[PDB]
Design a protein around this ligand. Structure first.
Ligand SMILES: On1ccc2ccccc2c1=S
Ligand SMILES: [Zn+2]
Length: 257
């Protein structure tokens, strides 16, 4: 099945998921000089005050922090979006080395990791119906660079040892995702896709310009996770990023001059 190795990595995914070579795949390189400022964009509204985390799961590809999305609680609106999108989970992509790991790149620059906060358009009722729609999802993407620690990340780092291997989950209540956000909400936006199979073309991507800093020790702990299940030969969960895909007939808009 799919993964990030030589035999089942991104260059193979198109055989099971032909949309891998579609018209609006993600990630992409953000060419800052070519992204035009769009003064009709609204500021982004991130309202995470009532977010309710439930659990953290090692899915064999990444770890997901999952939210109760049964009520209207943690929503993204404004920016390029029409209507209200509800937070359902976040996860990260990261490298084996600090010089790589992000999926989007900025003028070809790779960051050490990238956080994806996934939200679904509440006009479609739930996540499963939203991923059948071209405007079903909005993913807030945030780059990580290695430097000072991010205090708001530590509770996630500290729980990873309890979900080392594929299929493990742990209670993860009362986690506040506001602690993972940078100061500025300046962003680039474009239409794209999930960056993992099934690679569905549902996503309005909103990529923040300002990275957050995490410490070398924090990202080292992400790299101790495993892609394998318990009892299987250890394969470290590193380099779970898809490289940039062709922009095709898309424009990337900037919210800032
Ligand atoms: O990586 N990843 C995994 C699951 C998912 C689900 C909805 C939207 C985006 C994603 C991504 S980027
Ligand atoms: Zn992702």
């Amino acid at each position: 099945h799919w993964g990030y190795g030589k035999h089942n990595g991104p260059e193979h995914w198109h055989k099971d998921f032909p949309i891998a070579k579609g018209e609006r795949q993600s990630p992409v390189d953000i060419d800052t000089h070519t992204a035009k400022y769009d003064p009709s964009l609204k500021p982004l509204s991130v309202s995470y005050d009532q977010a309710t985390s439930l659990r953290i799961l090692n899915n064999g590809h990444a770890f997901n922090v999952e939210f109760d999305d049964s009520q209207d609680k943690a929503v993204l609106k404004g920016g390029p979006l029409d209507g209200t999108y509800r937070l359902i989970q976040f996860h990260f992509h990261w490298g084996s080395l600090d010089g790589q790991g992000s999926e989007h790149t900025v003028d070809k620059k790779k960051y050490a990791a990238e956080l994806h906060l996934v939200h679904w358009n509440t006009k479609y009722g739930d996540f499963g119906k939203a991923v059948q729609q071209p405007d079903g999802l909005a993913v807030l993407g945030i780059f990580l660079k290695v430097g000072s620690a991010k205090p708001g990340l530590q509770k996630v780092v500290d729980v990873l040892d309890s979900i080392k291997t594929k299929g493990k989950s742990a209670d993860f209540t009362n986690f506040d995702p506001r602690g993972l956000l940078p100061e500025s909400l300046d962003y680039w936006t474009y239409p794209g896709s999930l960056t993992t199979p099934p690679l569905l073309e549902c996503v309005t991507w909103i990529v923040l310009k300002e990275p957050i800093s995490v410490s070398s020790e924090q990202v080292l702990k992400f790299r101790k996770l495993n892609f394998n299940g318990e009892g299987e030969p250890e394969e470290l969960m590193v380099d779970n990023w898809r490289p940039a895909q062709p922009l095709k007939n898309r424009q990337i808009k900037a919210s800032f001059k």
